[PDB]
Design a protein around this ligand. Structure first.
Ligand SMILES: OC[C@@H]1O[C@@](CO)(O[C@H]2O[C@H](CO)[C@@H](O)[C@H](O)[C@H]2O)[C@@H](O)C1O
Ligand SMILES: OC[C@@H]1O[C@@](CO)(O[C@H]2O[C@H](CO)[C@@H](O)[C@H](O)[C@H]2O)[C@@H](O)C1O
Ligand SMILES: OC[C@@H]1O[C@@](CO)(O[C@H]2O[C@H](CO)[C@@H](O)[C@H](O)[C@H]2O)[C@@H](O)C1O
Ligand SMILES: OC[C@H]1O[C@@](CO)(O[C@H]2O[C@H](CO)[C@@H](O)[C@H](O)[C@H]2O)[C@@H](O)[C@@H]1O
Ligand SMILES: OC[C@H]1O[C@@](CO)(O[C@H]2O[C@H](CO)[C@@H](O)[C@H](O)[C@H]2O)[C@@H](O)[C@@H]1O
Ligand SMILES: OC[C@H]1O[C@@](CO)(O[C@H]2O[C@H](CO)[C@@H](O)[C@H](O)[C@H]2O)[C@@H](O)[C@@H]1O
Ligand SMILES: OC[C@H]1O[C@H](O[C@]2(CO)O[C@H](CO)[C@H](O)[C@@H]2O)[C@@H](O)[C@@H](O)[C@@H]1O
Ligand SMILES: OC[C@H]1O[C@H](O[C@]2(CO)O[C@H](CO)[C@H](O)[C@@H]2O)[C@@H](O)[C@@H](O)[C@@H]1O
Ligand SMILES: OC[C@H]1O[C@H](O[C@]2(CO)O[C@H](CO)[C@H](O)[C@@H]2O)[C@@H](O)[C@@H](O)[C@@H]1O
Ligand SMILES: [Cu+2]
Ligand SMILES: [Cu+2]
Ligand SMILES: [Cu+2]
Ligand SMILES: [Cu+2]
Ligand SMILES: [Cu+2]
Ligand SMILES: [Cu+2]
Lengths: 345, 345, 345
């Protein structure tokens, strides 16, 4: 009889995060979460390609859950009767029973309640894992998200100093494997089950057709760019449940980065690009110092520009010409430099 | 005239490890090992696909060798007359002569004796490297293993505390490149030499057809699952001589992980998934806290489930419901939750 | 009005590095550099395959720039009128305006001057990034290099001890995506623009046709091998602007390695193989202890041996038989060992 107070949590869709505290004086709680599996067709690129997705709570990625070390996490996983196949959930944050997967298999029309103790700090992947070849297929169909287990005293730099974020975003990256017809056009299917055989053939060759943030090419650009302001310290949680990624903030840095994502380790400082090993989450803090657009990418630039994996930040504030300035705008090349410039051919 | 006592070592087949000490009061020794190259056809998957393998001591991976810092490692490498081509050995643990490869080239019917000083602690790859295109081909045909050079005082956590394992397993991961015919069926060959040209064509495209532990899909499952017990601290050495991997213990963690595999560095704590850069070995300690089956995978789940790269641990002991419990078994979704659940579509 | 002394820098072609100091007593300077874009056909492999390359200063990689923390870096970027398209430059070392790219777009016949403050220590990638799909294309056509921002007191080991190199080399690794005809032969084009569509198709499948150091297979072998001597501490800077790499010095180690490349972090010690995440630079120090040839590779050995990614060091000095020796040259296998050797089949 676990005799701890209960605390409900209201999840929100990525890239935003439910309300939470960093440092807390609360004691351990039973933190109550609900995830509802949704099988649904989704648009994944700017040309309108559709996909038979499988998700937690209707999004790719599933929502970020936030708890503190020593909390107990009680998850009600629901599999609506309109879905077509069994699902479960594996928390990489949890200990035992294949992360929970061996205790959460549910058919359409069922729900189950799992409790796991948050004994390990960091950001962690969660994902569906029904068994055998269905494990990769459910994951790369969209059934993955992340959970953050904060120390009770919040984050620190590993050298005795507290670190605090003013804003948090969760960037879930998804590798997708979309069959093509003989002409090269992406194929559409009327159900996930119908897509499976052709999709497995693409999966086998290990080369995604799309690599996207928040479920679709362009999802976090334009009207949906991520907002920030000069002076704000922003935590960027990045997950990839199946395949490596190399995040980079174009025009910025990672001031403090937990590449492997685990807060019992000191973060690395001043990174250009970091590395999220497939099957994990990591996190980076950065304090914005300049206004403007920033692109946030995986720095395989082919994947970023051509397969979907670019987000934007729109940062308001005043430009700092000490950090960077255009000394001279574009102008003619002086003819007096001709010889000198021939040495650099 | 190196005047140190000699100590023979009797190698055993992976994933087990020859008898050794962690901390030792022995002084430096000439540690004597023998490796015998074996070219042999091997079954690599559950459908019975065969492969012309090339191995050290008849296994994929070659056996784990264990010594201590400051030992000298005297290796007799033997190339039986029934083999068909030259072989050698490169120790990433060693200094000079291309790791030993430039001193160990032997034809069928020859043996050679190499000695190297174990000046660097950690787990390290060893592999054949005859020269030019034969280097990748011999490696991805199976000619790679690992050596562990322990500190004399055993492992520590980088923060002044000793770490000791109760059990050790060596997981060698192998990327394989098996030609297919026009219909997609894997092709068989009567000798390694006959397989070479078609195999190089597959290698060139950098996408393995199989990714296996201990030489074959399913090798470390079923009857050959890895045994452990709740309370035991288990060291899991993982190597990959040619290609990256991202190990994960499903239902567990890496309590202490040397991702780059080198014991002069403190391990990272509490990892979900780690990263073995191709051409290296790493190691993870984990103390089992729950009984049951665990899967140990590379967390490209396509490779794990569909190309062969899953092992199992079978852990005996008592379940701990404080760490994880099924609060409610699968049940109907209440109709009273309909509206609420519509917000998660 | 930034009132600091100016210091010109004379760049040199990789793998060599312009003259510089490690520790310095100079105060902050405006360090003046010029890069001139060159579009040019280049030979990329030993069979004479040509490529429509795009470069900074005529080389792949672009030259290494070296400054100290707190310097201001004033770069004149020149786009000669004989080139065919716009170019710019993004410094991962810089803060704001997409690393400089949003302030440096120039047409053929133009030059621009950008200044950025070197507030972050480490080795960093710089690369062209005109916008959209041109970003990966310009990068994988050769438009990338690196900049090193040294602490003013030079490098240290993270444990209060200075580290100093006697020699520095910059190894830029380039993934190339060369179209083939129906027979498999590489195709030639009369301009970069003409190559683009076919090249993008290769890029999309994420598998390079070539992986090269210093712009071509064999560039840093034979007459162009890298020289060193026993006793010298050599810094090896490695960059990869678009794709992961796993450097390894065959016969050596990384004594001190900044895998993520950022000197505010302590280096790792005694690595066999390290990992350069695509979009970054890293660096390794190694003190040579044995003479001879060393190969320096990415340890995907297929890429190293078969797609171009092998360099050599030629190290002069005296062999140390204590570290490694051939105890017995190749000889017959004794018939007295037959039984014993049957246990290793
Ligand atoms: O609009 C952003 C911004 O809001 C300020 C309030 O004056 O801080 C607010 O937003 C940040 C970013 O979400 C949060 O960290 C604070 O909790 C919240 O009060 C502010 O500086 C400003 O102009
Ligand atoms: O059967 C495993 C198990 O054996 C015990 C002995 O009582 O420890 C033994 O095995 C472990 C795992 O190999 C080793 O570390 C010990 O050296 C060995 O004595 C035990 O707890 C038990 O039931
Ligand atoms: O020829 C290499 C070598 O040169 C010595 C000078 O006696 O050092 C010189 O070269 C190294 C490697 O570039 C530099 O670090 C020194 O600055 C330079 O003086 C030497 O030991 C030797 O035989
Ligand atoms: O990529 C193969 C080839 O297929 C075509 C259609 O025949 O386009 C497909 O692939 C493109 C790259 O992924 C997508 O942009 C497009 O949506 C898809 O139809 C050809 O245009 C292309 O050359
Ligand atoms: O994968 C191509 C295609 O080949 C076939 C046989 O024609 O199966 C081959 O590939 C499968 C996936 O690797 C293997 O399971 C099988 O052993 C091999 O024959 C087709 O079944 C498959 O669609
Ligand atoms: O690789 C496909 C096939 O193409 C051929 C020419 O028809 O060779 C091409 O590819 C080789 C491997 O990349 C290169 O060495 C060569 O330069 C290129 O023409 C065939 O020889 C090869 O089997
Ligand atoms: O003996 C079964 C106990 O374990 C259960 O968790 C799992 C269920 O799938 O049981 C084994 C552990 O031995 C599996 O590997 C899982 O870890 C518990 O819920 C429990 O009630 C059991 O007593
Ligand atoms: O001068 C040859 C000495 O080196 C030998 O090791 C190798 C042999 O292949 O020799 C060079 C080093 O210069 C190669 O690169 C290897 O390191 C030693 O065995 C030795 O006896 C020599 O004197
Ligand atoms: O308001 C424009 C200011 O920014 C300029 O740098 C860039 C130019 O492309 O401007 C925005 C920042 O808001 C872009 O994202 C870049 O960072 C400066 O040169 C400056 O003069 C401006 O005032
Ligand atoms: Cu599912
Ligand atoms: Cu998982
Ligand atoms: Cu061999
Ligand atoms: Cu090697
Ligand atoms: Cu350009
Ligand atoms: Cu970049």
């Amino acid at each position: 009889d676990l005799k701890l107070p209960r605390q409900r949590v209201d999840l929100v869709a990525p890239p935003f995060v439910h309300v939470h505290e960093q440092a807390t004086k609360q004691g351990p709680k039973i933190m109550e979460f609900k995830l509802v599996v949704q099988e649904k067709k989704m648009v994944i690129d700017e040309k309108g390609t559709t996909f038979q997705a499988m998700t937690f709570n209707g999004s790719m990625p599933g929502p970020l859950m936030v708890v503190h070390e020593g909390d107990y996490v009680e998850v009600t996983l629901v599999n609506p009767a309109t879905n077509t196949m069994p699902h479960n959930i594996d928390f990489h944050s949890a200990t035992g029973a294949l992360g929970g997967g061996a205790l959460t298999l549910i058919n359409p029309g069922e729900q189950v309640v799992l409790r796991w103790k948050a004994t390990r700090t960091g950001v962690f992947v969660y994902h569906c894992a029904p068994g055998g070849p269905m494990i990769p297929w459910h994951v790369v169909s969209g059934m993955n998200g992340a959970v953050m287990v904060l120390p009770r005293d919040g984050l620190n730099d590993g050298h005795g100093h507290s670190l605090r974020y003013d804003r948090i975003y969760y960037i879930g990256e998804q590798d997708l494997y979309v069959p093509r017809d003989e002409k090269g056009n992406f194929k559409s299917y009327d159900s996930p089950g119908e897509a499976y055989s052709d999709t497995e053939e693409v999966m086998r060759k290990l080369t995604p057709t799309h690599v996207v943030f928040n479920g679709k090419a362009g999802a976090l650009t334009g009207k949906n760019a991520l907002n920030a302001n000069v002076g704000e310290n922003v935590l960027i949680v990045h997950s990839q449940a199946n395949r490596d990624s190399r995040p980079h903030l174009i025009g910025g840095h990672g001031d403090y980065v937990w590449e492997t994502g685990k807060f019992s380790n000191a973060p690395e400082t001043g990174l250009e690009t970091w590395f999220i090993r497939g099957g994990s989450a990591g996190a980076a803090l950065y304090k914005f110092l300049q206004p403007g657009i920033y692109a946030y990418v995986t720095h395989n630039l082919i994947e970023a520009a051509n397969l979907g994996a670019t987000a934007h930040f729109k940062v308001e504030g005043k430009w700092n010409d000490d950090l960077m300035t255009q000394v001279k705008a574009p102008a003619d090349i002086p003819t007096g430099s001709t010889n000198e410039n021939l040495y650099f051919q």
